[PDB]
Write a protein that binds this DNA or RNA. Structure first.
Ligand SMILES: Nc1nc2c(ncn2[C@H]2C[C@H](O)[C@@H](COP(=O)(O)NP(=O)(O)OP(=O)(O)O)O2)c(=O)[nH]1
Ligand SMILES: [Mn+2]
Ligand SMILES: [Mn+2]
Length: 430
DNA sequence: ATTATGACGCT
DNA sequence: AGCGTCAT
């Protein structure tokens, strides 16, 4: 009872940009704004592959992973923007720079954890304590939460979406105890006020809209963020978890969408996250390992301890290109030329990183895939990265992979390569 | 012939 | 160190 810690110590937010690459292209080209729009890489094969979709286009069924030609079948008026091509490959520099814009704004409010190109976690615990001190017990006005949904409300005792949102927010605010500076629900609420301010700053200063989740940990904040996209934020309280999880398919929780989640479902004969509560911690550890079992036991009760890492910058800088079907690399000249192209992009990105961020990578990872292997990587080899020189990096990558070529002929490469990947890692302050 | 990444766990 | 998983 009283000693049963409830995972309510922290306030954590997850901010995720809406259809990010689409918004970057819509800012640049006003003709794409408020239209069914998608971003594609390449063009020749099936119109190119879609990686981002505006919410207008999603209404027609357009999705990530779809070929543009098929998307045009669903939505003939779909507008398309192509990712830049440099040195023969997709070049994502424009979106990385737009990402830095957003991350720098977020960092004004709190130390952030960059989780991807378009989303970051925020530990708002301390900022919430400060704003609570300033409030002096003043209640929180619904006017300060103009885009916030409270998950699970309204309940009990109404036709429009905004009306439902305000109804739920009113129920939430009317139930709040604002004389208690340690009430977790009050803390989440103040956290949501701060996130409204953060999202307002992002849109004012970049033109980009985002959604957000506010809860007591990273997994619940990420799930919350998804509930009311786009351009809205959602508060998931500790108390909302039993109802939320009672119908939540296990695969919706981050990290359970793959083989482990499928094993949970098959071994335990369950479907929803809430069903996990009936097992003991030892039972779950016995099926899924000590770490996974402890994580599942806590997570199905809304409890998770993974910290928001103080990390605004990526830990690695990498360059990769697939060579599918008949484009697979089958000569030594080909393999060398593409290693050079990747290494030249890598050198450019690394040199800009060193100038911006006062650090130097010290290890080069070379990964390849060979024809007939379904795995992502067929082989990974590291070597030393001592100079930011593309010619040296590509020569070193060739040296570490060249023993892969089973061809007796010096010129031919067999079996052909379906992927090259260069990744700079193990950064040190310079 | 989804593709270009990036994070992290395991042994 | 090299490989596998998860993500998207
Ligand atoms: N190159 C590449 N980029 C990708 C891929 N998948 C996503 N991206 C890029 C393009 C995406 O714009 C960006 C962020 O990924 P999300 O947050 O998962 N999707 P979004 O922000 O579009 O929509 P939502 O409003 O639902 O969050 O990552 C991929 O497979 N490859
Ligand atoms: Mn996004
Ligand atoms: Mn994202």
């Amino acid at each position: 009872g009283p000693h049963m810690a409830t995972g309510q110590d922290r306030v954590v937010a997850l901010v995720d940009m809406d259809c990010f690459f689409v918004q970057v292209e819509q800012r640049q080209n006003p003709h794409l704004r408020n239209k069914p729009c998608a971003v594609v890489q390449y063009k020749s094969w099936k119109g190119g592959g879609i990686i981002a979709v505006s919410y207008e286009a999603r209404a027609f069924g357009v999705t990530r992973s779809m070929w543009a030609d098929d998307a045009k079948k669903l939505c003939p008026d779909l507008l398309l923007a192509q990712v830049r091509e440099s040195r023969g490959k997709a070049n994502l520099t424009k979106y990385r720079e737009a990402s830095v814009e957003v991350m720098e704004i977020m960092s004004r409010f709190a130390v952030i954890e960059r989780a991807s190109i378009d989303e970051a976690y925020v530990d708002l615990t301390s900022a919430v304590q400060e704003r609570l001190q300033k409030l002096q017990g003043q209640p929180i006005s619904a006017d300060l939460l103009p885009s916030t949904y409270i998950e699970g409300l309204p309940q009990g005792p109404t036709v429009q979406k905004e009306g439902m949102r305000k109804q739920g927010l009113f129920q939430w605010l009317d139930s709040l105890q604002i004389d208690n500076l340690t009430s977790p629900d009050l803390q989440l609420t103040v956290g949501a006020v701060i996130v409204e301010e953060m999202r307002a700053a992002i849109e004012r200063e970049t033109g980009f809209q985002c959604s957000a989740g506010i809860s007591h940990n990273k997994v619940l904040a990420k799930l919350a963020c998804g509930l009311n996209k786009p351009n809205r934020q959602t508060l998931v309280s500790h108390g909302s978890v039993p109802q939320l999880f009672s119908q939540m398919p296990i695969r919706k929780i981050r990290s359970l969408g793959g083989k482990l989640g499928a094993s949970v479902i098959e071994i335990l004969g369950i479907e929803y996250m809430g069903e996990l509560t009936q097992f003991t911690e030892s039972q779950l550890q016995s099926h899924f390992g000590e770490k996974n079992g402890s994580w599942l036991y806590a997570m199905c009760r809304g409890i998770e301890h993974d910290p928001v890492k103080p990390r605004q910058l990526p830990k690695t800088i990498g360059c990769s290109k697939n060579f599918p079907g008949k484009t697979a690399l089958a000569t030594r000249e080909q393999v060398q030329w593409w290693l050079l192209q990747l290494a030249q992009e890598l050198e450019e990105r690394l040199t800009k990183d060193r100038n911006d961020n006062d650090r130097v990578a010290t290890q080069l990872v070379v990964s390849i895939r060979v024809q007939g292997d379904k795995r992502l990587s067929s082989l990974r080899r590291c070597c030393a990265l001592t100079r930011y020189d593309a010619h040296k990096m590509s020569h070193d990558a060739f040296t570490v992979i060249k023993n892969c070529n089973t061809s007796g002929i010096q010129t031919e490469w067999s079996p052909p390569l379906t992927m090259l990947f260069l990744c700079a890692t193990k950064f040190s302050a310079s």
